[PDB]
Structures are given as structure tokens and as C-alpha cells.
Write an enzyme that holds these catalytic residues in place. Structure first.
Site, PDB file in Angstrom:
ATOM      1  N   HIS A  40     -60.077  24.154  56.639  1.00  0.00           N
ATOM      2  CA  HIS A  40     -60.105  23.720  58.071  1.00  0.00           C
ATOM      3  C   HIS A  40     -58.893  24.526  58.675  1.00  0.00           C
ATOM      4  CE1 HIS A  40     -56.166  21.511  57.040  1.00  0.00           C
ATOM      5  NE2 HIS A  40     -55.815  21.886  58.288  1.00  0.00           N
ATOM      6  N   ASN A  54     -38.625  33.673  57.077  1.00  0.00           N
ATOM      7  CA  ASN A  54     -38.430  33.342  58.288  1.00  0.00           C
ATOM      8  C   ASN A  54     -39.762  33.921  59.013  1.00  0.00           C
ATOM      9  OD1 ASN A  54     -37.750  33.409  61.315  1.00  0.00           O
ATOM     10  ND2 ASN A  54     -35.445  32.782  60.729  1.00  0.00           N
ATOM     11  N   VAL A  57     -38.473  36.464  62.071  1.00  0.00           N
ATOM     12  CA  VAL A  57     -37.738  37.664  61.795  1.00  0.00           C
ATOM     13  C   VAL A  57     -38.219  38.489  60.891  1.00  0.00           C
ATOM     14  CG1 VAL A  57     -35.465  38.307  61.388  1.00  0.00           C
ATOM     15  CG2 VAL A  57     -36.052  36.054  62.491  1.00  0.00           C
ATOM     16  N   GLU A  62     -41.795  41.488  54.066  1.00  0.00           N
ATOM     17  CA  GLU A  62     -43.200  40.989  54.458  1.00  0.00           C
ATOM     18  C   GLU A  62     -44.384  41.990  54.226  1.00  0.00           C
ATOM     19  OE1 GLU A  62     -40.676  41.406  56.291  1.00  0.00           O
ATOM     20  OE2 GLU A  62     -40.155  39.292  57.205  1.00  0.00           O
ATOM     21  N   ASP A  84     -62.149  20.806  51.182  1.00  0.00           N
ATOM     22  CA  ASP A  84     -61.384  21.730  52.141  1.00  0.00           C
ATOM     23  C   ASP A  84     -60.536  22.761  51.157  1.00  0.00           C
ATOM     24  OD1 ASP A  84     -59.949  22.334  54.374  1.00  0.00           O
ATOM     25  OD2 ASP A  84     -58.361  20.919  54.108  1.00  0.00           O
ATOM     26  N   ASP A 171     -43.325  14.434  53.306  1.00  0.00           N
ATOM     27  CA  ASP A 171     -44.822  14.529  53.311  1.00  0.00           C
ATOM     28  C   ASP A 171     -45.057  15.766  54.160  1.00  0.00           C
ATOM     29  OD1 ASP A 171     -47.569  13.899  53.446  1.00  0.00           O
ATOM     30  OD2 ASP A 171     -47.440  12.525  55.223  1.00  0.00           O
ATOM     31  N   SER A 172     -46.275  16.280  53.844  1.00  0.00           N
ATOM     32  CA  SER A 172     -46.628  17.470  54.473  1.00  0.00           C
ATOM     33  C   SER A 172     -46.773  17.138  55.851  1.00  0.00           C
ATOM     34  CB  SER A 172     -47.982  18.282  54.122  1.00  0.00           C
ATOM     35  OG  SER A 172     -47.951  18.569  52.680  1.00  0.00           O
ATOM     36  N   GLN A 174     -48.224  18.857  60.148  1.00  0.00           N
ATOM     37  CA  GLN A 174     -49.043  19.755  60.776  1.00  0.00           C
ATOM     38  C   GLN A 174     -48.381  21.258  60.703  1.00  0.00           C
ATOM     39  OE1 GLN A 174     -49.457  22.785  63.344  1.00  0.00           O
ATOM     40  NE2 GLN A 174     -49.585  21.310  65.091  1.00  0.00           N
ATOM     41  N   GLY A 175     -49.385  22.376  60.439  1.00  0.00           N
ATOM     42  CA  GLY A 175     -48.727  23.510  60.007  1.00  0.00           C
ATOM     43  C   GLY A 175     -48.632  23.630  58.611  1.00  0.00           C
ATOM     44  N   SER A 177     -50.795  22.894  56.413  1.00  0.00           N
ATOM     45  CA  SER A 177     -52.215  22.872  56.096  1.00  0.00           C
ATOM     46  C   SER A 177     -52.372  24.305  55.561  1.00  0.00           C
ATOM     47  CB  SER A 177     -52.927  22.610  57.379  1.00  0.00           C
ATOM     48  OG  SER A 177     -53.026  21.389  57.650  1.00  0.00           O
ATOM     49  N   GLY A 178     -53.249  24.303  54.362  1.00  0.00           N
ATOM     50  CA  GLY A 178     -53.809  25.394  53.532  1.00  0.00           C
ATOM     51  C   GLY A 178     -52.819  25.643  52.666  1.00  0.00           C
TER      52      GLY A 178
HETATM   53  O1  LIG Z   1     -55.362  12.023  60.539  1.00  0.00           O
HETATM   54  C1  LIG Z   1     -55.756  13.102  61.160  1.00  0.00           C
HETATM   55  C2  LIG Z   1     -57.205  13.649  60.518  1.00  0.00           C
HETATM   56  C3  LIG Z   1     -57.152  13.793  59.021  1.00  0.00           C
HETATM   57  C4  LIG Z   1     -58.442  13.694  58.299  1.00  0.00           C
HETATM   58  N1  LIG Z   1     -59.362  12.473  58.619  1.00  0.00           N
HETATM   59  C5  LIG Z   1     -60.251  11.929  58.010  1.00  0.00           C
HETATM   60  C6  LIG Z   1     -61.399  11.211  58.324  1.00  0.00           C
HETATM   61  C7  LIG Z   1     -62.285  10.713  57.423  1.00  0.00           C
HETATM   62  N2  LIG Z   1     -62.334  10.965  56.304  1.00  0.00           N
HETATM   63  C8  LIG Z   1     -61.232  11.881  55.712  1.00  0.00           C
HETATM   64  C9  LIG Z   1     -60.255  12.538  56.561  1.00  0.00           C
HETATM   65  C10 LIG Z   1     -59.563  12.407  60.359  1.00  0.00           C
HETATM   66  C11 LIG Z   1     -58.151  12.467  60.846  1.00  0.00           C
HETATM   67  N3  LIG Z   1     -54.671  13.757  61.673  1.00  0.00           N
HETATM   68  C12 LIG Z   1     -53.410  13.232  62.019  1.00  0.00           C
HETATM   69  C13 LIG Z   1     -52.322  14.037  61.365  1.00  0.00           C
HETATM   70  N4  LIG Z   1     -52.687  15.545  61.956  1.00  0.00           N
HETATM   71  S1  LIG Z   1     -51.321  16.208  61.394  1.00  0.00           S
HETATM   72  O2  LIG Z   1     -50.122  15.498  61.900  1.00  0.00           O
HETATM   73  O3  LIG Z   1     -51.482  17.567  62.133  1.00  0.00           O
HETATM   74  C14 LIG Z   1     -51.343  16.810  59.675  1.00  0.00           C
HETATM   75  C15 LIG Z   1     -51.830  17.865  59.153  1.00  0.00           C
HETATM   76  C16 LIG Z   1     -52.210  18.120  57.973  1.00  0.00           C
HETATM   77  C17 LIG Z   1     -51.733  17.095  57.014  1.00  0.00           C
HETATM   78  C18 LIG Z   1     -51.542  17.391  55.593  1.00  0.00           C
HETATM   79  C19 LIG Z   1     -51.101  16.485  54.754  1.00  0.00           C
HETATM   80 CL1  LIG Z   1     -51.255  16.834  53.059  1.00  0.00          CL
HETATM   81  C20 LIG Z   1     -50.355  15.353  55.252  1.00  0.00           C
HETATM   82  C21 LIG Z   1     -50.475  15.050  56.528  1.00  0.00           C
HETATM   83  C22 LIG Z   1     -51.105  15.970  57.434  1.00  0.00           C
HETATM   84  C23 LIG Z   1     -50.712  15.679  58.939  1.00  0.00           C
HETATM   85  C24 LIG Z   1     -53.856  15.945  61.474  1.00  0.00           C
HETATM   86  C25 LIG Z   1     -55.127  15.100  62.054  1.00  0.00           C
HETATM   87 CA   LIG Z   2     -40.268  37.148  58.368  1.00  0.00          CA
END
Ligand SMILES: O=C(C1CCN(c2ccncc2)CC1)N1CCN(S(=O)(=O)c2ccc3cc(Cl)ccc3c2)CC1
Ligand SMILES: [Ca+2]
Length: 223
Positions: A40, A54, A57, A62, A84, A171-172, A174-175, A177-178
Site C-alpha cells: 500500500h 531525523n 536533517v 544517510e 500487503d 500503536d502504529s 499513519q506514516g 506504514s511499510g
Molecule cells: O481504517 C483504515 C483503513 C484500514 C484498512 N481497511 C480494511 C478494510 C477491510 N479489510 C481490511 C482492512 C480499510 C480502512 N484507515 C484508518 C487509519 N488510517 S491511518 O490512521 O492512516 C493508519 C495507517 C496505518 C496503520 C498501521 C497500523 Cl499497524 C495501525 C494503525 C494504522 C493507522 C489508515 C486508513
Molecule cells: Ca537525516
């Protein structure tokens, strides 16, 4: 990472920052020419930034290497987030040292109770927005499939596992990811998805890397 701590410069040497003019995803250096990340996180023009702490910077350790080839998993489903995982081949080999190193692929799958280290430059707020410039870390146990499947009814496949705290707070986000989910020195997961960050009873879901070792190896060996 929400509720995490500052990792410390280069203490997570396999952590990579996928940069497309800005950090957008993390990744794990699995060898000098390959980075594993979330499918993703796929983007064209990915520049892999190794030896980062950082991200704003130039601290001197790097290695900015552009990707030569990106390979998203053949069965990656962006809807379910199943499979994924994505491999990124570097245009040139990374100079592996103490600050930039590869993380070992697992020989077996980690189980519930296994403590892991999740790292990333993702949002540190569960309700709000604050992106750290330095790598954050979070120690979180892999949750039981039952807890995982119960938290996410019919959404957890065999290629996913929950890690974190059902009480929320850590928890993890946004950002992240990966990013790597390393347990006992082995890359067991890839920060994949969650319904939010640090939500009560909604642990993060990670790509079960152990199911992809064969694909990873075969792919790398032929590209
Ligand atoms: O709920 C979602 C998606 C997540 C994936 N999702 C499905 C839907 C159906 N089946 C499986 C997954 C559809 C909605 N999001 C809300 C959270 N955001 S996020 O805050 O940017 C985010 C991104 C990556 C994350 C990774 C982790 Cl391990 C934990 C929280 C995370 C939260 C991403 C999209
Ligand atoms: Ca740096």
C-alpha cells in the site's frame, strides 16, 4: 507511532524511509539491494533513505538510493489489504555498516505473546496530528489470532496478525506504514493497517512476513 519512545539514532539500522520528496512510508532493508515495505506504500519515484534518524536533517549517515524496481505482491489486494507487502530493489547497493544494516527474514512465524519492536516516523497522536522528525519505537506483543479476528471480524487473513495493546494508547499510525515489526531480530511484520491509531480494542494489523519468505527469496533471486 503513538505512545512510543524515541528510538535513538540508528538503533533500528534496517529502518528505511521511503521518500518521494517527503517521507511517506517506512520499510526494512532486507539486504544491500532490497527493501521490503507495505504494498500500500507503492509509489513511483521512490527514493529509499537509509541510515535515517531525523528525516529533516542530514546527520551524516544517510544513504539516499533511488529504487530501480518495485514489486508489489502478486496477490496484493488493496481492498482487504491482504498480501500487503512490496519489494523495492535499489538502483545501487546500500553500503551496509553499523548504522545501516539489513534485518533478517524469519525462519518461522512469530506467535501470540511474542514481543516486537515497531518503528516509524508516523503520526504520534491517537487523536490529533504530530509527526516526529526522529524515528519512534514501540514495543508491542503479537496478539492472539482470536483477539485479532475479534477486533477485526472477517478482516484478518492468514497473512495478517495483530500486535499492540487492546487497551489502546500504543500503536502504529499513519506514516508508519511499510515499517518493520521485528521480533527477536527477525522481521515478522510490516506495519499494514488499523481502524485508527491507539484505539481501545483496535490493535494494529501487520503483514505476516513469515508467509512471504519464499516469495521474497524467489523474487530477489530473479531480479
Ligand atoms: O481504517 C483504515 C483503513 C484500514 C484498512 N481497511 C480494511 C478494510 C477491510 N479489510 C481490511 C482492512 C480499510 C480502512 N484507515 C484508518 C487509519 N488510517 S491511518 O490512521 O492512516 C493508519 C495507517 C496505518 C496503520 C498501521 C497500523 Cl499497524 C495501525 C494503525 C494504522 C493507522 C489508515 C486508513
Ligand atoms: Ca537525516
Amino acid at each position: 507511532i503513538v505512545g512510543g519512545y524515541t528510538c535513538g539514532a540508528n538503533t533500528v539500522p534496517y529502518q528505511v524511509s521511503l521518500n518521494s520528496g517527503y517521507h511517506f512510508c517506512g520499510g526494512s532493508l532486507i539486504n544491500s539491494q532490497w527493501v521490503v515495505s507495505a504494498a500500500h506504500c507503492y509509489k513511483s519515484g521512490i527514493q529509499v533513505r537509509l541510515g535515517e534518524d531525523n528525516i529533516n536533517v542530514v546527520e551524516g549517515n544517510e544513504q539516499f538510493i533511488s529504487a530501480s524496481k518495485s514489486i508489489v505482491h502478486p496477490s496484493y489486494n488493496s481492498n482487504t489489504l491482504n498480501n500487503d507487502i512490496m519489494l523495492i530493489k535499489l538502483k545501487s547497493a546500500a553500503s551496509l555498516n553499523s548504522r545501516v544494516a539489513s534485518i533478517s527474514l524469519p525462519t518461522s512465524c512469530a506467535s501470540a505473546g511474542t514481543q516486537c519492536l515497531i518503528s516509524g516516523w508516523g503520526n504520534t497522536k491517537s487523536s490529533g496530528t504530530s509527526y516526529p522528525d526522529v524515528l519512534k519505537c514501540l514495543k508491542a506483543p503479537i496478539l492472539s489470532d482470536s483477539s485479532c479476528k475479534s477486533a477485526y471480524p472477517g478482516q484478518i487473513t492468514s497473512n495478517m496478525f495483530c500486535a499492540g495493546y487492546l487497551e489502546g494508547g500504543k500503536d502504529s499510525c499513519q506514516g508508519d506504514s511499510g515499517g518493520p515489526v521485528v521480533c527477536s531480530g527477525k522481521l515478522q511484520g510490516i506495519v499494514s493497517w488499523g481502524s485508527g491509531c491507539a484505539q481501545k480494542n483496535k490493535p494494529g494489523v501487520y503483514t505476516k512476513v513469515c508467509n512471504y519468505v519464499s516469495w521474497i527469496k524467489q523474487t530477489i533471486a530473479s531480479n
